[PDB]
Amino acid sequence: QTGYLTIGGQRYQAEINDLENLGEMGQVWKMRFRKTGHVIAVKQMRRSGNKEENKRILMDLDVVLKSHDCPYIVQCFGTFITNTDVFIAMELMGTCAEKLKKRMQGPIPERILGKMTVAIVKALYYLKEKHGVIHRDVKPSNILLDERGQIKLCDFGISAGCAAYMAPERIDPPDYDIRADVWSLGISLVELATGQFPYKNCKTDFEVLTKVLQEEPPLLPGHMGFSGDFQSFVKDCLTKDHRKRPKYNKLLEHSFIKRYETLEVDVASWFKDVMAKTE
C-alpha cells in the first residue's frame, strides 16, 4: 500500500507533488502536506544511491511499518514510490536527545530521563518479543522528542553499532548480544544525566573499547542528588559481565521503571522551554 498518507485516522490518496518541501533537517526532509496542512518528515531514498546505504533504509522501514502498535517508535504514515526515488513519510518530532544535550549546555533533569527510560526500554522489549529484532545501536541520536511530551525510537538500519556505546560482550564475545542494548542505554543515561560523555579524552575508537573493558563501569556521581532508584538502574544496565545483565522482563519490574509509569510528569512544558533558548 503506497501513495496513501494516514495522519491520525484519515487515509489520503496523494502523490509526492502534494507535499511542499520546507528544507533539509537532521536525506530526510521536513515537508508540508498541502491538501490538509500537516507538516511531516519525508526520508528520500535515491534509486541511484549507495547499495549499502539504501539497504539500511529498507531494513528500518520494514520494522517501522510492522511497529504500528508500538507508541514508542516513530510511525510511518505512508510511502511514495516513483520511477526515480522512494519517499518515506515519517511523523515529525521536535529533536533528538543528542541535540537536547547541546541545547541544554548541561545535564537533563532526572524526571525527564525517567519517562525517557520507560519509553526506550518498552521499545526494545517490543522489538525483542513482537518481531525478535535487536536494535544494536542505542544512543542519544536515536531518541526523539516533541513538544507534546512523547519520546520514541528512531530508525535502526543495523537491526556494527557505534563504538562508544558498545557493550562489553559485543567487543569480546565469548563463544551473542541478546541484552547488549541494555548497556548502550546505560551509557546514554550517564551522558544525558551528567552532560559529559563517560569515556572522555578518547581520540580513537579503540580507546573507548579499552576503557570499557579495562575500567569499571562509569556510574552516576552521588553529589548531584540523583534518586536511589535511578542509580541502581544505571548499575544494573552497566553490569560488566554479560551473563549477569538483567533482561528486559526484569527491567520493566525495576523500582525506577515502575516509578515513572504511574507518575505523570510534564515533558511537553519542559521541552518547549529548553527549545525556546535557541542560538
> Is residue 26 marked as binding?
yes
> Is residue 43 marked as binding?
yes
Choice between 150 and 231, CB closer to ligand 1XZ: 150
Distance between CA atoms of residues 168 and 166, nearest Å: 7
Choice between 41 and 257, CB closer to ligand 1XZ: 41
For residue 179, count other CB atoms closer than 10 A to its CB. Answer: 22
Greatest CA span in the chain, whole angstroms?
59
State the nearest-atom distance from the C-beta of 144 to ligand 1XZ, in Å. Answer: 5
Choice between 147 and 229, CB closer to ligand 1XZ: 147
Q: Which of 60, 69, 137, 172 is catalytic?
A: 137
> Is residue 93 marked as binding?
no
Distance, CA of 184 to chain centre? 11
Helix, strand, coil fractions of the chain, as percent rounded to 5: 40, 20, 40
Looking at this protein, which amino acid is placed at residue 206?
F
Distance between CA atoms of residues 82 and 85, nearest Å: 6
> Is residue 244 marked as binding?
no
State the nearest-atom distance from the C-beta of 272 to ligand 1XZ, in Å. Answer: 8
- Report the interface residues with ligand 1XZ, using CB under 6 A: 25-26, 28, 30, 39, 41, 74, 90-96, 98-99, 141, 144, 147, 154
Q: Is 149 exposed, middle or buried (0-12, 13-18, 19+ CB in 10 A)?
A: middle
Choice between 26 and 221, CB closer to ligand 1XZ: 26
State the nearest-atom distance from the C-beta of 89 to ligand 1XZ, in Å. Answer: 10
For residue 124, count other CB atoms closer than 10 A to its CB. Answer: 23
Q: Which residue is nearest to ligand 1XZ (CB)?
A: 96
Q: Is 37 exposed, middle or buried (0-12, 13-18, 19+ CB in 10 A)?
A: exposed
State the nearest-atom distance from the C-beta of 113 to ligand 1XZ, in Å. Answer: 16
> Is residue 25 marked as binding?
yes
241 has catalytic annotation? no
Task: Extract the annotated binding site.
Answer: 25-28, 43
Catalytic residue ranges: 137
Task: Extract the annotated binding site for ATP.
Answer: 25-28, 43
